[PDB]
Amino acid sequence: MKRQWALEDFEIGRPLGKGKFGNVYLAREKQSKFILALKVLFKAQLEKAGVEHQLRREVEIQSHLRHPNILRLYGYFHDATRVYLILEYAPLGTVYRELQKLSKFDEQRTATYITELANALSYCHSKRVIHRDIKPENLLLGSAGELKIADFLDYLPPEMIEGRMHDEKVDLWSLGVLCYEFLVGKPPFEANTYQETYKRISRVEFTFPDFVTEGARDLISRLLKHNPSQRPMLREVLEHPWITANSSKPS
Numbered sequence: 001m002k003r004q005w006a007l008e009d010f011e012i013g014r015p016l017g018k019g020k021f022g023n024v025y026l027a028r029e030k031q032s033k034f035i036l037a038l039k040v041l042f043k044a045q046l047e048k049a050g051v052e053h054q055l056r057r058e059v060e061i062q063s064h065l066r067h068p069n070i071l072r073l074y075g076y077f078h079d080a081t082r083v084y085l086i087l088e089y090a091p092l093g094t095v096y097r098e099l100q101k102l103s104k105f106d107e108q109r110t111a112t113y114i115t116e117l118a119n120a121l122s123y124c125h126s127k128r129v130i131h132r133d134i135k136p137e138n139l140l141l142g143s144a145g146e147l148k149i150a151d152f153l154d155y156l157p158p159e160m161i162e163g164r165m166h167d168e169k170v171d172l173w174s175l176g177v178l179c180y181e182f183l184v185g186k187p188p189f190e191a192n193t194y195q196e197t198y199k200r201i202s203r204v205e206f207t208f209p210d211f212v213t214e215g216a217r218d219l220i221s222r223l224l225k226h227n228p229s230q231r232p233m234l235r236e237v238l239e240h241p242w243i244t245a246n247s248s249k250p251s
């Protein structure tokens with residue numbers, strides 16, 4: 001059995017974002033007055049892009065994922081022409097916004113984010129879920145500033161762009177790209193053209209600014225290994241001395 005939700009059950013607030021298949025609004029559940037976000041998807045648009053099959057597959061997975069660093073999908077419902085997703089509300093916004101405001105993150109904030117991401121990714125893997133889009137724009141912040149993965153070229157690993165087989169190790173690479181962007185302000189393989197970026201990634205060609213410490217370089221260099229098997233395991237990330245020295249939160 002399950003709960004039956006309806007549009008009438010929520011008081012719609014301000015728009016939080018405008019996506020390709022619809023809008024996300026802040027909402028208040030009429031009964032409990034609980035604050036949450038309502039993602040409104042349009043069927044006509046989902047069909048025209050034949051992503052329906054994908055939406056349905058992500059919703060099923062997202063429903064079974066319960067982790068403090070993963071945005072919660074509370075439920076869903078639909079009507080004549082729209083599909084509604086009931087989501088957790090992250091009051092402090094996106095890491096992307098924070099990154100743009102600060103230009104770059106200090107070691108403590110970065111180490112903490114990487115710790116939360118590694119824990120979320122470890123949980124995902126334990127549930128056979130892999131390849132999460134953890135770009136800054138897909139990362140939300142909870143009431144206490146805790147990270148929340150919200151995913152319902154600069155970050156693709158060599159194996160994917162080179163047209164090869166990939167596994168959970170792609171998430172390790174992603175973590176490396178993010179750690180660098182957090183500390184630096186921009187992803188490591190940025191270039192003028194897609195072609196140049198692909199080449200930068202394939203050859204694992206990137207440089208460190210002078211303010212990136214030895215500990216960070218060690219971790220990032222290890223995560224960004226061309227050969228997936230050479231990349232550390234998530235628990236090794238969590239035990240990395242740079243992480244245990246700077247993370248304001250335990251694993």
Ligand SMILES: CCCC(=O)Nc1n[nH]c2cc(-c3ccc(O)cc3)ccc12
Pocket residue numbers: 016017019024037039087088089090091092093094140150151152
């Ligand atoms: C200061 C306000 C901060 C804010 O907007 N916070 C948010 N809480 N919950 C969300 C869900 C999404 C979302 C994610 C993925 C998706 O497909 C649809 C919607 C986007 C943003 C938020």
